[PDB]
């Protein structure tokens, strides 16, 4: 049960902010869980998705064991693109299939200056508890 | 037997029927001896057979 008087639980209100959200906010909902190996080593459960991360699909028709890299983070449609997540168009070309970030697992992170700082900040909050 | 100590005027409500056990009351010798015998016989409609023919 939520006790904060200034946070609403209204269905329409919550939906409106989710569908009408600025991109920098949308990145926060653009979050995916790390695999067990990153989670144990980084002590972090979930991370926002990025343009180049090794990503594994765990739900849907394309669910499998193969590892792929994100190639586009389409924040407008709340989807991302991996290489081998494709289907065959009618004429003959090949198009990507949008997969929601919550339905994938990050197997390798785009280790970067801002990134490296992000994990240790989340991780150091764990030893607080 | 004693009033409430934290309401300043309240005593528990009383009962309109102290012994709410009909079976205990009804099937007791004090009541039974005062009753008349039950009439369990059933008298159904009698078909009027016609005299002067029967």
């Amino acid at each position: 049960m939520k006790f904060n008087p200034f946070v609403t639980s209204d269905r329409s209100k919550n939906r409106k902010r989710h569908f009408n959200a600025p991109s920098h906010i949308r990145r926060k909902i653009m979050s995916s869980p790390l695999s067990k190996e990153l989670r144990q080593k980084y002590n972090v459960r979930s991370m926002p998705i990025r343009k180049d991360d090794e990503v594994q699909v765990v739900r849907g028709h394309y669910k499998g064991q193969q590892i792929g890299k994100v190639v586009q983070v389409y924040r407008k449609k709340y989807v991302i693109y991996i290489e081998r997540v494709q289907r065959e168009k009618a004429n003959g070309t090949t198009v990507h299939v949008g997969i929601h970030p919550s339905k994938v697992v990050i197997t390798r992170l785009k280790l970067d200056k801002d990134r490296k700082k992000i994990l240790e900040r989340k991780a150091k909050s764990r030893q607080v508890g | 037997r004693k009033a409430a100590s934290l309401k300043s005027n309240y005593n528990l409500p009383m009962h309109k029927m102290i012994n709410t056990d009909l079976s205990r009351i009804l099937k007791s010798p004090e009541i039974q001896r005062a009753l008349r015998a039950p009439r369990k016989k059933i008298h159904r409609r009698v078909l009027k057979k016609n005299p002067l023919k029967n």
Partner: protein
Amino acid sequence: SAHLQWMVVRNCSSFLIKRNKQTYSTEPNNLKARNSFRYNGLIHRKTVGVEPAADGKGVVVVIKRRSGQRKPATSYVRTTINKNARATLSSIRHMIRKNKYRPDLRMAAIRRASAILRSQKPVMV
């Protein structure tokens, strides 16, 4: 008190089914599973109930202990019967008539037992 409790659950109970111009009541130990003051396994000081065993062999006869009326954990003692059908009815009949333990469900208890034994034997095609 049984009569006082009956006037409360007479029309408002979670075990009451009202449907198709018929009424049924589904408390555990209720023979004939009907809404009546007589056939209620909850409001009487003493009740009689028969259920199929945990497995499909025999019946379980449960009757209500006199003392622990407000202690449902130990209020009911259960016994299992796995003898012949004729032996079962003879055994059950003695629990009611000889003990004088509610000698009004005696005929009802045998009927429910006989129905249960029919369900335990295989059904032919």
